[PDB]
Amino acid sequence: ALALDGKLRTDSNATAAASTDFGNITSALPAAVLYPSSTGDLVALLSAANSTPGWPYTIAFRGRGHSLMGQAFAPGGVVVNMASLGDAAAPPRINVSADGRYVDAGGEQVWIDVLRASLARGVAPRSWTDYLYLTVGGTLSNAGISGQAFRHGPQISNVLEMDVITGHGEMVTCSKQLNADLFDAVLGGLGQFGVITRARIAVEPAPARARWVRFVYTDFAAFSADQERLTAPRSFGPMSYVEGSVFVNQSLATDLANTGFFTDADVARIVALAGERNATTVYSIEATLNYAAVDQELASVLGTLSYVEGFAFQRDVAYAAFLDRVHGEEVALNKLGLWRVPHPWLNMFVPRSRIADFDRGVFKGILQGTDIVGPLIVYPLNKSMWDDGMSAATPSEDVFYAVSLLFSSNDLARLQEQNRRILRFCDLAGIQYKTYLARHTDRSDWVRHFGAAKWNRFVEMKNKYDPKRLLSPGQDIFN
Numbered sequence: 001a002l003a004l005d006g007k008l009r010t011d012s013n014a015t016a017a018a019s020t021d022f023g024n025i026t027s028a029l030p031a032a033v034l035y036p037s038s039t040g041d042l043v044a045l046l047s048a049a050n051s052t053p054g055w056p057y058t059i060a061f062r063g064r065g066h067s068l069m070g071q072a073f074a075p076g077g078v079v080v081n082m083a084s085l086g087d088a089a090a091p092p093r094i095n096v097s098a099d100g101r102y103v104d105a106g107g108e109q110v111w112i113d114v115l116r117a118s119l120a121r122g123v124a125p126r127s128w129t130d131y132l133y134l135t136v137g138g139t140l141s142n143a144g145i146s147g148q149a150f151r152h153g154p155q156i157s158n159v160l161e162m163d164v165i166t167g168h169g170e171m172v173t174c175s176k177q178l179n180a181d182l183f184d185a186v187l188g189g190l191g192q193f194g195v196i197t198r199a200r201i202a203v204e205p206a207p208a209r210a211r212w213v214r215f216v217y218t219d220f221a222a223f224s225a226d227q228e229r230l231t232a233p234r235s236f237g238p239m240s241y242v243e244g245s246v247f248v249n250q251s252l253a254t255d256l257a258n259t260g261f262f263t264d265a266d267v268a269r270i271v272a273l274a275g276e277r278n279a280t281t282v283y284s285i286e287a288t289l290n291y292a293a294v295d296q297e298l299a300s301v302l303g304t305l306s307y308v309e310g311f312a313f314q315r316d317v318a319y320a321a322f323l324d325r326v327h328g329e330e331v332a333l334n335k336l337g338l339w340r341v342p343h344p345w346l347n348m349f350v351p352r353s354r355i356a357d358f359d360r361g362v363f364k365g366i367l368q369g370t371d372i373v374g375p376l377i378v379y380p381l382n383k384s385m386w387d388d389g390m391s392a393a394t395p396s397e398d399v400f401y402a403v404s405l406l407f408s409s410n411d412l413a414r415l416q417e418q419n420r421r422i423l424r425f426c427d428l429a430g431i432q433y434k435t436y437l438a439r440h441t442d443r444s445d446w447v448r449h450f451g452a453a454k455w456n457r458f459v460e461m462k463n464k465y466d467p468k469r470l471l472s473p474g475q476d477i478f479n
Ligand SMILES: *Cc1cc2c(cc1C)nc1c(=O)[nH]c(=O)nc-1n2C[C@H](O)[C@H](O)[C@H](O)COP(=O)(O)OP(=O)(O)OC[C@H]1O[C@@H](n2cnc3c(N)ncnc32)[C@H](O)[C@@H]1O
Pocket: 022, 060, 061, 062, 063, 064, 065, 066, 067, 068, 071, 072, 082, 107, 108, 128, 129, 130, 131, 134, 135, 136, 137, 138, 139, 141, 142, 143, 144, 145, 146, 190, 191, 192, 194, 195, 196, 197, 437, 472, 474, 475
């Protein structure tokens, strides 16, 4: 029925396209790929799966395939090409509310398009990812983090309601007020319980511009203390965005130039500073202030900090230009053939109490004497802005750090071994980290990830909403 309407494709080109992802490390061929024209086509697929004894196929929902390790694959199953839902000109897949207090976006829609539609109405989401060509449904199935998360929470903390089609093939609207169990389960739920077809996203009046700063440190203690100062609850401080970067000695000049922030003269100055201090690691805080008045506001904030004098670097850009900054990085890297390469990325949340230990073992230890390509990102988050009732798993401490080591790749094998070594260091040091964007491959690891109480809830929701265990099998939780 769906195949006759040209929606369910089994041809080699279709299956091949749905068999690889951004990670470029693992691959898995699906039996078929659905190209739905409407949510009705998704209901039809999931209802058939629910009602058919001996239903053969697991089902995955491909956003834009930005997964690192096959999370969007359905080996010998059906991959849903979610993007197809946004093919038609009418009706619109992104609706800013009449009063401009929220935006309704299709699960398949990319955040860059959500931004553009929001700005047309003078508004914008409050919480972002660093990179905007990701789907609403995709990031909400994980968490969605960037430099705003310390004060607004992750993207999953900025959703009012969702439309979800469950593994039973039932279309359900959920929120804190209605079907809250499904609402909580789906958010950070790794595509396990149903497909998000619509999410209601909180917005704020859009700032016009961003004052954009980078501050340089050679001392980790000063660097991390200042990050924590900038992101501390008062309500929060003036800064709209706070992240940080780590630069190892061997690839210092190259990595500093690769930020796209520093000029060649700026890079030379930082290299000279590291040299005079014999520093093996350099650290940079990246922060923005959304808006003569800005000058004094910025001066007042910087006066509370302890970066190396003479090493505050400033840019002033349009708000939208700041948010979409990484798009220009992709275009440039792809032209050099350096974008579509293996990405053995390591992402985790590290408790505040152990971040100095992590720095000693990893940045000052394991990563020393290697040529690093890709950013090493480190910044604090506030647990208070996360809802522990949702599926997403975080460390127990009030403050924990996002640590994102975004390695680009003989080299791949070395990098995979290096990541195993970093994880081994953390385990032996007894650091109670949580991975982010990673899939585990056995039960014990997944139970450890969630913790006993949250795992038991996760299973309860799985039995209620996907009892056949069909959905997002690439997560390797129930498959
Ligand atoms: C590619 C990449 C990823 C990325 C990033 C930069 C790059 C270049 N920067 C990020 C950032 O700054 N902050 C952050 O939180 N994440 C960042 N990412 C990682 C990204 O969030 C993940 O890749 C995420 O999966 C979103 O990517 P995408 O939208 O392409 O989704 P997918 O990989 O195809 O699918 C991921 C899993 O989710 C399930 N899924 C997908 N759509 C839905 C819907 N609508 N409903 C329910 N589940 C869904 C898939 O089945 C899969 O398991």
